[PDB]
Structure formats: structure tokens, C-alpha cells
Amino acid sequence: CRAGPLQWLCEKYFG
């Protein structure tokens, strides 16, 4: 995961 632009996305959706 891109730990900035997608960080929120990865945590929320992708666990």
C-alpha cells in the first residue's frame, strides 16, 4: 500500500 494517498483506503477497506 502507498502509505499516504491510499493509507486510509487500505486500512478502512483492505483491512
Side-chain angles (χ1 to χ4, degrees):
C1 183
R2 298 192 300 168
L6 301 178
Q7 189 167 242
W8 65 279
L9 218 168
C10 299
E11 294 299 282
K12 189 168 70 181
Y13 292 85
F14 318 154

PDB file of all heavy atoms in Angstrom:
ATOM      1  N   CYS A   1       0.830  -1.217   0.000  1.00  0.00           N
ATOM      2  CA  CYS A   1       0.000   0.000   0.000  1.00  0.00           C
ATOM      3  C   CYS A   1       0.861   1.262   0.000  1.00  0.00           C
ATOM      4  O   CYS A   1       1.881   1.311   0.686  1.00  0.00           O
ATOM      5  CB  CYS A   1      -0.944   0.018   1.207  1.00  0.00           C
ATOM      6  SG  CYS A   1      -2.061   1.446   1.248  1.00  0.00           S
ATOM      7  N   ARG A   2       0.433   2.292  -0.739  1.00  0.00           N
ATOM      8  CA  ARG A   2       1.040   3.610  -0.674  1.00  0.00           C
ATOM      9  C   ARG A   2       0.633   4.263   0.649  1.00  0.00           C
ATOM     10  O   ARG A   2      -0.514   4.687   0.801  1.00  0.00           O
ATOM     11  CB  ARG A   2       0.608   4.463  -1.872  1.00  0.00           C
ATOM     12  CG  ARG A   2       1.069   3.860  -3.206  1.00  0.00           C
ATOM     13  CD  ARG A   2       0.882   4.863  -4.349  1.00  0.00           C
ATOM     14  NE  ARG A   2      -0.523   5.262  -4.497  1.00  0.00           N
ATOM     15  CZ  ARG A   2      -0.957   6.290  -5.246  1.00  0.00           C
ATOM     16  NH1 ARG A   2      -0.096   7.042  -5.946  1.00  0.00           N
ATOM     17  NH2 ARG A   2      -2.266   6.567  -5.296  1.00  0.00           N
ATOM     18  N   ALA A   3       1.574   4.319   1.602  1.00  0.00           N
ATOM     19  CA  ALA A   3       1.366   4.826   2.952  1.00  0.00           C
ATOM     20  C   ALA A   3       1.297   6.357   2.957  1.00  0.00           C
ATOM     21  O   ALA A   3       2.180   7.032   3.484  1.00  0.00           O
ATOM     22  CB  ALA A   3       2.482   4.300   3.862  1.00  0.00           C
ATOM     23  N   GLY A   4       0.225   6.895   2.372  1.00  0.00           N
ATOM     24  CA  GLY A   4      -0.061   8.315   2.311  1.00  0.00           C
ATOM     25  C   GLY A   4      -1.371   8.527   1.554  1.00  0.00           C
ATOM     26  O   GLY A   4      -2.404   8.744   2.184  1.00  0.00           O
ATOM     27  N   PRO A   5      -1.350   8.451   0.213  1.00  0.00           N
ATOM     28  CA  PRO A   5      -2.514   8.699  -0.623  1.00  0.00           C
ATOM     29  C   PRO A   5      -3.579   7.608  -0.482  1.00  0.00           C
ATOM     30  O   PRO A   5      -4.763   7.915  -0.602  1.00  0.00           O
ATOM     31  CB  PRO A   5      -1.978   8.789  -2.056  1.00  0.00           C
ATOM     32  CG  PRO A   5      -0.728   7.914  -2.015  1.00  0.00           C
ATOM     33  CD  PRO A   5      -0.184   8.167  -0.610  1.00  0.00           C
ATOM     34  N   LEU A   6      -3.170   6.353  -0.244  1.00  0.00           N
ATOM     35  CA  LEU A   6      -4.076   5.213  -0.120  1.00  0.00           C
ATOM     36  C   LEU A   6      -4.109   4.637   1.297  1.00  0.00           C
ATOM     37  O   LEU A   6      -4.807   3.652   1.507  1.00  0.00           O
ATOM     38  CB  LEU A   6      -3.666   4.107  -1.107  1.00  0.00           C
ATOM     39  CG  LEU A   6      -3.669   4.524  -2.585  1.00  0.00           C
ATOM     40  CD1 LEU A   6      -3.198   3.331  -3.427  1.00  0.00           C
ATOM     41  CD2 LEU A   6      -5.064   4.941  -3.066  1.00  0.00           C
ATOM     42  N   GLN A   7      -3.375   5.205   2.264  1.00  0.00           N
ATOM     43  CA  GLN A   7      -3.242   4.623   3.598  1.00  0.00           C
ATOM     44  C   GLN A   7      -4.607   4.386   4.248  1.00  0.00           C
ATOM     45  O   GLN A   7      -4.926   3.264   4.634  1.00  0.00           O
ATOM     46  CB  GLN A   7      -2.356   5.528   4.460  1.00  0.00           C
ATOM     47  CG  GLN A   7      -1.992   4.868   5.794  1.00  0.00           C
ATOM     48  CD  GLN A   7      -0.865   5.629   6.491  1.00  0.00           C
ATOM     49  OE1 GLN A   7       0.211   5.080   6.716  1.00  0.00           O
ATOM     50  NE2 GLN A   7      -1.101   6.899   6.821  1.00  0.00           N
ATOM     51  N   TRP A   8      -5.416   5.448   4.323  1.00  0.00           N
ATOM     52  CA  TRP A   8      -6.793   5.419   4.797  1.00  0.00           C
ATOM     53  C   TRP A   8      -7.603   4.315   4.111  1.00  0.00           C
ATOM     54  O   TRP A   8      -8.364   3.605   4.764  1.00  0.00           O
ATOM     55  CB  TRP A   8      -7.432   6.790   4.539  1.00  0.00           C
ATOM     56  CG  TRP A   8      -7.592   7.168   3.094  1.00  0.00           C
ATOM     57  CD1 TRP A   8      -6.622   7.669   2.297  1.00  0.00           C
ATOM     58  CD2 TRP A   8      -8.760   6.999   2.234  1.00  0.00           C
ATOM     59  NE1 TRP A   8      -7.104   7.834   1.016  1.00  0.00           N
ATOM     60  CE2 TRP A   8      -8.422   7.442   0.922  1.00  0.00           C
ATOM     61  CE3 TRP A   8     -10.064   6.483   2.418  1.00  0.00           C
ATOM     62  CZ2 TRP A   8      -9.335   7.402  -0.143  1.00  0.00           C
ATOM     63  CZ3 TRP A   8     -10.994   6.462   1.362  1.00  0.00           C
ATOM     64  CH2 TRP A   8     -10.633   6.921   0.084  1.00  0.00           C
ATOM     65  N   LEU A   9      -7.441   4.193   2.789  1.00  0.00           N
ATOM     66  CA  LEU A   9      -8.202   3.297   1.936  1.00  0.00           C
ATOM     67  C   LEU A   9      -7.855   1.849   2.287  1.00  0.00           C
ATOM     68  O   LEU A   9      -8.740   1.030   2.519  1.00  0.00           O
ATOM     69  CB  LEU A   9      -7.900   3.650   0.464  1.00  0.00           C
ATOM     70  CG  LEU A   9      -9.129   3.556  -0.453  1.00  0.00           C
ATOM     71  CD1 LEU A   9      -8.819   4.199  -1.810  1.00  0.00           C
ATOM     72  CD2 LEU A   9      -9.539   2.106  -0.692  1.00  0.00           C
ATOM     73  N   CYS A  10      -6.555   1.550   2.366  1.00  0.00           N
ATOM     74  CA  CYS A  10      -6.036   0.232   2.685  1.00  0.00           C
ATOM     75  C   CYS A  10      -6.486  -0.222   4.071  1.00  0.00           C
ATOM     76  O   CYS A  10      -6.916  -1.361   4.226  1.00  0.00           O
ATOM     77  CB  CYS A  10      -4.511   0.236   2.562  1.00  0.00           C
ATOM     78  SG  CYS A  10      -3.907   0.633   0.899  1.00  0.00           S
ATOM     79  N   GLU A  11      -6.407   0.660   5.073  1.00  0.00           N
ATOM     80  CA  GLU A  11      -6.846   0.336   6.423  1.00  0.00           C
ATOM     81  C   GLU A  11      -8.361   0.108   6.470  1.00  0.00           C
ATOM     82  O   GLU A  11      -8.814  -0.902   7.005  1.00  0.00           O
ATOM     83  CB  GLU A  11      -6.411   1.433   7.403  1.00  0.00           C
ATOM     84  CG  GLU A  11      -4.884   1.512   7.550  1.00  0.00           C
ATOM     85  CD  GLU A  11      -4.292   0.213   8.093  1.00  0.00           C
ATOM     86  OE1 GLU A  11      -4.401   0.008   9.321  1.00  0.00           O
ATOM     87  OE2 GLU A  11      -3.748  -0.556   7.269  1.00  0.00           O
ATOM     88  N   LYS A  12      -9.143   1.044   5.923  1.00  0.00           N
ATOM     89  CA  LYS A  12     -10.594   1.021   6.035  1.00  0.00           C
ATOM     90  C   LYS A  12     -11.204  -0.147   5.253  1.00  0.00           C
ATOM     91  O   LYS A  12     -11.992  -0.908   5.810  1.00  0.00           O
ATOM     92  CB  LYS A  12     -11.161   2.377   5.594  1.00  0.00           C
ATOM     93  CG  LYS A  12     -12.661   2.487   5.899  1.00  0.00           C
ATOM     94  CD  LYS A  12     -13.178   3.922   5.735  1.00  0.00           C
ATOM     95  CE  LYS A  12     -13.199   4.360   4.267  1.00  0.00           C
ATOM     96  NZ  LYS A  12     -13.680   5.744   4.126  1.00  0.00           N
ATOM     97  N   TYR A  13     -10.852  -0.281   3.968  1.00  0.00           N
ATOM     98  CA  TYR A  13     -11.420  -1.284   3.079  1.00  0.00           C
ATOM     99  C   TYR A  13     -10.611  -2.579   3.128  1.00  0.00           C
ATOM    100  O   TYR A  13     -11.179  -3.640   3.384  1.00  0.00           O
ATOM    101  CB  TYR A  13     -11.486  -0.760   1.640  1.00  0.00           C
ATOM    102  CG  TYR A  13     -12.475   0.369   1.409  1.00  0.00           C
ATOM    103  CD1 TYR A  13     -12.099   1.702   1.655  1.00  0.00           C
ATOM    104  CD2 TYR A  13     -13.734   0.098   0.841  1.00  0.00           C
ATOM    105  CE1 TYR A  13     -12.937   2.758   1.262  1.00  0.00           C
ATOM    106  CE2 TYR A  13     -14.596   1.153   0.495  1.00  0.00           C
ATOM    107  CZ  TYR A  13     -14.191   2.484   0.690  1.00  0.00           C
ATOM    108  OH  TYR A  13     -15.013   3.508   0.321  1.00  0.00           O
ATOM    109  N   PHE A  14      -9.298  -2.509   2.869  1.00  0.00           N
ATOM    110  CA  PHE A  14      -8.475  -3.701   2.673  1.00  0.00           C
ATOM    111  C   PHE A  14      -7.883  -4.219   3.994  1.00  0.00           C
ATOM    112  O   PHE A  14      -6.877  -4.927   3.972  1.00  0.00           O
ATOM    113  CB  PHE A  14      -7.348  -3.433   1.655  1.00  0.00           C
ATOM    114  CG  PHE A  14      -7.672  -2.642   0.394  1.00  0.00           C
ATOM    115  CD1 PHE A  14      -6.634  -1.934  -0.244  1.00  0.00           C
ATOM    116  CD2 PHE A  14      -8.963  -2.631  -0.171  1.00  0.00           C
ATOM    117  CE1 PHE A  14      -6.905  -1.132  -1.364  1.00  0.00           C
ATOM    118  CE2 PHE A  14      -9.235  -1.823  -1.291  1.00  0.00           C
ATOM    119  CZ  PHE A  14      -8.208  -1.063  -1.880  1.00  0.00           C
ATOM    120  N   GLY A  15      -8.482  -3.872   5.144  1.00  0.00           N
ATOM    121  CA  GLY A  15      -8.038  -4.325   6.455  1.00  0.00           C
ATOM    122  C   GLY A  15      -6.861  -3.499   6.982  1.00  0.00           C
ATOM    123  O   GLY A  15      -6.934  -2.937   8.073  1.00  0.00           O
TER     124      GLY A  15
END
